């Protein structure tokens, strides 16, 4: 169910690092957020409201959207607040 996408995570605003992760769109901004975790060493954790920036596109997004309905696609650099 859905579409798969290849994007990019960025961390700059905790421990800094950058992977790439692909996914199906139907997932919420949020899921981004959960693997991220799961994947690096961030001793952290997050920050509430689970917000997102998408760099290349300058806006952000709530991480309850739908990253379908966010536009969100390969290419896309989802920079976690």
């Not at 169910?1 to 990019?8: A, C, F, L, R």
């Not at 800094?16 to 899921?31: A, E, I, M, T």
Request: hydrophobic share 35%; net charge negative; aromatic share 8%.
């Amino acid at each position: 169910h859905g579409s798969y996408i290849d994007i990019t995570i960025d961390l700059k605003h905790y421990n800094g690092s950058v992977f790439d992760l692909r996914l199906s769109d139907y997932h919420p901004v949020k899921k981004v957020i959960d693997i991220a975790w799961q994947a690096q060493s961030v001793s952290m954790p997050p920050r509430e409201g689970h917000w997102i920036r998408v760099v290349n596109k300058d806006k952000v997004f709530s991480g309850e959207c739908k990253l379908s309905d966010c536009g969100i696609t390969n290419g896309d650099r989802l920079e976690i607040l």
